[PDB]
Design a protein around this ligand. Structure first.
Ligand SMILES: OC[C@H]1O[C@H](O[C@H]2[C@@H](O)[C@H](O)[C@@H](CO)O[C@@H]2O)[C@@H](O)[C@@H](O)[C@@H]1O
Ligand SMILES: OC[C@H]1O[C@H](O[C@H]2[C@@H](O)[C@H](O)[C@@H](CO)O[C@@H]2O)[C@@H](O)[C@@H](O)[C@@H]1O
Ligand SMILES: OC[C@H]1O[C@H](O[C@H]2[C@@H](O)[C@H](O)[C@@H](CO)O[C@@H]2O)[C@@H](O)[C@@H](O)[C@@H]1O
Lengths: 138, 140, 140, 140, 140, 140, 140
């Protein structure tokens, strides 16, 4: 496993979504024009009908990316407000098959992450996504 | 199964539909939508070697688009727009094929799914006056 | 047959027509249309090794385009615009070839089909004053 | 023959002309046109191994463009603009070669033909004060 | 050495810094800058196999960008903007990697260097309230 | 000969010039032009293995461009602008090489020729105060 | 020699300079220019395996640009702007490398040379308060 920097604030309840010998097949991002933040994320893993969720699903928008079993992330950008009082603002992902999604806003700070097979996510959430970091295979 | 089910997106309303063929795939798919409600109202599908039309929803929109699919031709990119919620609806579809054919139907103002790719084999969801919910189905 | 029939789109009106030739393909196609009605009115087709001009519909429009097709040249992209319904009509045609030639004829305000691709071999549909419906025919 | 004849487009007016040479091809072509009438008026042509200039039409226009063609050079895209009708006229010519050379001469605010491609071998049509019609001729 | 040192650009101010490691390269670099002063203020760096964060300058800017670098990933394009002079400053950085990742930080209004390319191994310069001077370091 | 002569374009005025060398090619060419008259006034040429500068016309323009040509480098695109007529003049030159070098000199408002391509070997035409006419010369 | 000398462009004044090294090539070049006079004023050059900085002209401009050159990296495009005349001057430089690096320094309002390409090995010309003239030098 490769751990990409968790970006955003130090707030919210911790979460770690990863599963032995499995990878992410679906990820959903929920955000608002009201606060220009991510509020909620859900993830499903290959061979597991369970939905792992975090944060309050209170936003007016929601995008889903479904990921073929041989499909990698070749480009990834997370927008955030920096600081202890920080927050995760947006996500742009682009895959090895030219699929892409764009969620929320990118007006303050950006990270272009590591690339590879997306395997999990970790960070903190409450009303909002406080911090978010991606996890890849090695 | 031998099938991949992409998420049914939209609401919980309407009459169920499931359109698949055991040793067959979709060769033609049609989307009907309105500028009045910015929704998808009606869908039709034909399957390889079968002139019969499987249809669902009320064909009441002012626009229709049809995509024909060559027998060796895959979907390499697929986006469905929808309103989220139990009271949700399907809003638009963009498909792009392995031969650079593409279609764009309805609106993409609220929520989006970029689906799984592959040989498009069927569709399932619910419809009434509108397309309440839609999920694509692929081979392996 | 050894032919692929793309959906005839438009209305149910007009006199039937079918233009094909055994062991022959289309080398020239002409579209005639009006800004007055935003419709196709007339189509002509010539086939390799055949000096005859096969025509249908009333040649009443203010615009004409001709596409000539080299013997080894395929259609790699094809879009037909139409008004849907029993009362429908064929509104426009956009073709792009394997040699980067392209044409755009009439209007695409209501409904679209992206057809099958391949070596264009014939056309079938109905015409009178206008082109009621039209469908392309390719080779396998 | 061993020649491919693109459609002569334009009107039925003027004196006929045919510019070809057995075992020869065109190395230079000149188009003369006016902003006053938005028409071609005059064409000149030279052939490989022949210092003679073949001309047709009245050279009265304010613009002139010349395309020289290398011996292994081929036309990969060609458009002629024209006014349709018995009283028709040739309005413009756009050629693009296999070496990325191109020219654009006169106007295209009317009917258009995308012709056949290949080694340009000659031209035929009718001319007087104006170029009434024009058709390209290629090898095989 | 085993290292290529690109010119330190900017002023002679601030506290020196040198961030390198034996048998190691940079996996993460962060730039902090302001719209108020159109300068870089703060930089952080992590190295492969070392959870420590090496920092310099005052983190007082309204913007931050981070570039994470895969173990086999090189810099193929690099531009640093700066004010020249003893009282100089580092104004902006544009980096582009061998995997098409890129970042753009701060402003490019006065002077530019396009640096040497390769596997980024470290950085060195001076910082205080702002980043006074900066120079990249690559492998061989 | 072993030479290809592009059309001399422009007027019939000025003193003749012909600049060529057996078993030699052009390595440098300079064009001098004015915004006052929108004409070329002066041209210079150097040949491989020959320190001499061959010049013609009055060097009175406010602009000069020089193209140096590597020994294996060809002209793949060439455009000369001119006023047609007995009282004609050469107005501008665009050249583009096999290595993507290019130059653009003077104006292109009236008439254009896209010439033959190849290894540029010499120039011929007439000059006085202005470049009256100009024709390029290539190898085989 | 084993060197190619591109035309020195600009005026005949300034103090002569020639920067070359046997079995060595340029790894860094810096250009200093002003918006006040729209001229280059100063140039510095470093060579592979030589910590010395070779400089010429008065470093009085408000802008500076530096290009670093990897050991296997060539100039594939070079453009120098200048004022022509005995009282001439060098106005700007644009360089593009075989790795897609580039720089742009000063102004290009009067005259241009698109010089020879290859491995940049040295520079020669004249300088004082400004860069009177400048010529690049390449390998073979
Ligand atoms: O196409 C040009 C035309 O030139 C000559 O006729 C011209 C003129 O004299 C006539 O008055 C008008 C009438 O329509 O036509 C031309 O402008 C003839 O050579 C004619 O055959 C030719 O078409
Ligand atoms: O990095 C800029 C600057 O930082 C520090 O200087 C600060 C302050 O003490 C100085 O007085 C003012 C300028 O006079 O600049 C900053 O506010 C020092 O580290 C200095 O070396 C450096 O230039
Ligand atoms: O290109 C710089 C220029 O520097 C020197 O000339 C300077 C001065 O001495 C001249 O008199 C003024 C004229 O007002 O021009 C410069 O300021 C000389 O080295 C000269 O050759 C050179 O051009």
């Amino acid at each position: 496993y490769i751990y990409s920097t968790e970006v955003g604030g130090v707030g919210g309840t911790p979460f770690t979504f990863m599963q032995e010998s499995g990878t992410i097949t679906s990820i959903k991002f929920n955000w608002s024009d009201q606060y220009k933040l991510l509020h909620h994320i859900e993830v499903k893993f290959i061979n597991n009908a369970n939905i792992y969720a975090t944060g309050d699903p209170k936003g007016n928008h929601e995008v889903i990316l479904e990921i073929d079993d041989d499909e990698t992330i070749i480009g990834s950008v997370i927008g955030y407000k920096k600081g202890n009082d920080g927050r995760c603002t947006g996500v742009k992902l682009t895959t090895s098959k030219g699929k892409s999604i764009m969620a929320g806003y990118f007006e303050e700070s950006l990270i272009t992450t590591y690339t590879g097979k997306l395997a999990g996510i970790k960070g903190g959430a409450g009303s909002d996504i406080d911090r978010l970091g991606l996890i890849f295979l090695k």
